[PDB]
């Protein structure tokens, strides 16, 4: 339950979430928890443009997710997660951040490679099977992390 973000960020979250989110309480709770669990992530609001051209200001959480120093070869991916205004009824959506990143620094051996489309959107299995009543933002990033991980050593 320890909070890693400073007061200015908590107050900011309080402020920006209110006007946008159908369920501000859950969005605030899940966003704060995410930031507290993944210290490389930061929040901002940005305009997301929908498929039909409609722009919508949304909370976005961004940063570089990296495998831990656990003896395995390190892998990192810069991502941008968007929280839709109907969260958690609707799932977040996540893309690779294409600044200073070449999507081709990701081994085809990495399980995550399979889920990244030509446009940079990451179709994580958890998002496809989203359960509004049982899932949160942390679980999304945890799955992302588990797919970045070097696949286990075998003896073949």
């Amino acid at each position: 339950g320890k909070i890693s973000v400073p007061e200015a960020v908590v107050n900011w979250l309080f402020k920006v979430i209110q006007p946008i989110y159908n369920d501000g309480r859950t969005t605030f709770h899940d966003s704060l928890a995410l930031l507290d669990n993944f210290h490389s992530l930061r929040p901002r609001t940005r305009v997301f443009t929908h498929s039909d051209g409609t722009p919508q200001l949304l909370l976005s959480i961004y940063g570089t997710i990296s495998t831990g120093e656990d003896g395995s070869s390190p892998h990192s991916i810069p991502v941008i997660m968007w929280v839709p205004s109907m969260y958690p009824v609707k799932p977040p959506f996540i893309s690779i951040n294409l600044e200073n990143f070449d999507m081709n620094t990701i081994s085809s051996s990495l399980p995550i490679q399979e889920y990244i489309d030509s446009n940079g959107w990451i179709a994580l299995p958890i998002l496809h099977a989203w359960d509004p009543a049982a899932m949160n933002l942390i679980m999304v990033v945890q799955e992302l992390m588990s797919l970045l991980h070097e696949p286990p050593q075998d003896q073949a």
Binding site: A8, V9, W12, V16, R42, P43, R44, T45, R46
Partner: peptide, 8 residues
Amino acid sequence: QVPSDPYN
């Protein structure tokens, strides 16, 4: 509101 960023 317009876009904002407590870090930038």
